[PDB]
Symmetry: D3
Subunit: 155 residues, 6 copies
């Protein structure tokens, strides 16, 4: 039985994230989305977890959990040793490569990167929030449920 962890802050989850979740769930027997609790953002951890669960309702082999500290501990504690992450640019690859090599060195945990779907290559949680704050329409870039909650926080 194979498995991977998809880590992030997901504040909020975007369609870019969801695309990665879907592709991981299609290729591994089990996927765990790991939501970081940090020393902070727009949505509480529980809010983020619920938005991810709504968006991944049709992925039966994917579950969502929170964690803190070293990601490789979160991964190994659950019997796995693979991370799956989405990538948008060469710059992304160079920073993430450092962390991937470090994670493999310290804990034997592998990282698999997947290129973003072209349609979602310019979406990030940060930019979506920023645009929405000033009234820009980001409804095509977020799951439907997320866009609903986001308008709420902003009002």
């Amino acid at each position: 039985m194979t498995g991977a962890v998809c880590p992030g802050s997901f504040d909020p989850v975007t369609l870019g994230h969801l695309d990665v979740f879907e592709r991981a769930a299609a290729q591994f027997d089990e996927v765990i989305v790991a939501v970081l609790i940090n020393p902070a953002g727009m949505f509480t951890v529980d809010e983020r977890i619920e938005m991810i669960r709504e968006s991944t309702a049709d992925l039966p082999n994917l579950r969502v959990e929170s964690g803190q500290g070293l990601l490789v501990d979160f991964v190994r504690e659950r019997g796995l040793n693979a991370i799956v992450k989405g990538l948008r640019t060469g710059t992304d690859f160079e920073y993430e490569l450092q962390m991937a090599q470090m994670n493999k060195h310290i804990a034997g945990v592998d990282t698999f990167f997947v290129a973003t779907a072209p349609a979602y290559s310019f979406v990030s949680s940060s930019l979506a929030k920023e645009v929405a704050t000033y009234g820009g329409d980001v409804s095509a870039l977020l799951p439907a449920s997320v866009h609903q909650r986001l308008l709420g926080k902003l009002r």
Copy 2:
């Protein structure tokens, strides 16, 4: 039954490739190494030679097999009932041009591509640079499996 295809020309296979094979074999139920052959331009090693060098250095990976092919990689993948490619990457430059091919492959056949950063120690080895260095007498013994190094010197002499 999960599975992935690890493609390349593997002319010859390097320790960087082998590292990628091992990591894929650890994470997928089956792995197929796809040895892509250009029917127009012969490489240094024949198809038989390429496959033998890979098999000899992967004997301890019981869920990996090696097959050659040509034409579209996505056809090789789909005809085996799979839809994942695993490829090793060294640089940001690598990521950008492989990004193009992965998006195209997803578009035309729904095949996914997963990239892995190769191990630091093998980051600077490529089949082509190993060949070039060996051609002019440089020592590349530590970058190639034992199944390769002396066959390579043999080809060159």
Copy 3:
């Protein structure tokens, strides 16, 4: 009297190229597509395919050329190039030619990011995929696609 030149081999023109043409036509009074003159299509064929695909762009025209792009540009009274860009790698090598062109002829180059949907399309990859039976119909203008099938079949 603003104007820009959109250069390339366009063998064949793709929807990525067409997107750039449309954006250049929307921002300059005058756009010329400059077709460089052994690929798949003849110069006349490439010109025709672009003309077919840009009929709704009244301020655009298509011409062939040879030699330095800056001479093609300057001989038509203009001094700006508009070119599409996909990657950072693209930017760094196009940057060298942009600075060279500015240096030798005072011709400016404006780059525009490809539309997300065409980030992975190029003339070369479309031909390669199509050659092995892959469906590239969503990546090429309708006219082009039929013509491409013909060259292969």
Copy 4:
């Protein structure tokens, strides 16, 4: 009726920025420099410094703004941004914002490669160097440089 907006904080404007302004003014009928509103200079100060440095550009004006750049652009009847670029790293992060801006408001972005001589100048590095006594006089408009000395001395 062509036009483009050149955005930034310009704290202060550098010769790199000015080069881009001049190139945009040469290719569009109308250029607006958009100054975003705790840096070194006040908004009024930054606006003044740019106006001083662009007196020879008759089709350029300088205005301050807040919020989404695309709204600043659209509210003035335009839909193009012109921005200067130094590196491939620059292109990849600016690319994300360019595609976002096109998506949300249909505003195009044209990038231009910095002049070779200004490849290493930025507002931040000029301030940092000047703060420790380094001579940045060859990298800033004459007016700006004097004003900068004043803020430090």
Copy 5:
């Protein structure tokens, strides 16, 4: 009498830094490690601690010395009668932003900068990532000299 300055905050020095020091010491008659201290924000280690960790792991480099400084690097370099900086680089992204600073330093003071690719084995270590990983309990003993690892754990506990 040739010479180069190797700058950094070295908070703490890593094996990647040490590799760069050794390569500079091999190619220049004298090398000065320049420990740059921000008078506004304290790092994890004091200036004394940073210098001691560097000295302890460079004892076999007789043409290298260690001095702290602040403000413009080019002033530190020129006041010692030198005009070369040697810096290690990992990525293309590293090269682009260090490129800016090297051009600026050449412009304002005529100081040259030479970059070296760090060794593959140390490519992914940085002072900041080593600190972050150690903070949350990860094992970074193989990435730092002996002079550093336990002092680091000490700071953290």
Copy 6:
């Protein structure tokens, strides 16, 4: 006594190359410019060597020699173990990094990279030849003597 080798095809030498030569000569006791003879280009090896010698007449600690085969053999045969090369882009760095790591691995030879002077960041031997072929003026980008010879070959 310190030393470095500056390798290339130099077909022809540009002001970008010369800038690198000057900076190497200022920092090492001895510099050797190594001109590759290849399996080819516009200028013969002897022509290239003479153009480099004219351009570096004021660098007494720099000499010019031809070589073939493995660069690290050329370097070690002359008692040195350092290469100095100019770099223009991050892309350049990524390709050259591979070769530098390989050269250090196989022969213990170090490589030091130096960023191009801003004024010469867009010049290359290849682009200068191409531009000159079609009548473009590249005289500000090449040593004076080189531009003279180049016009000759083209006529």
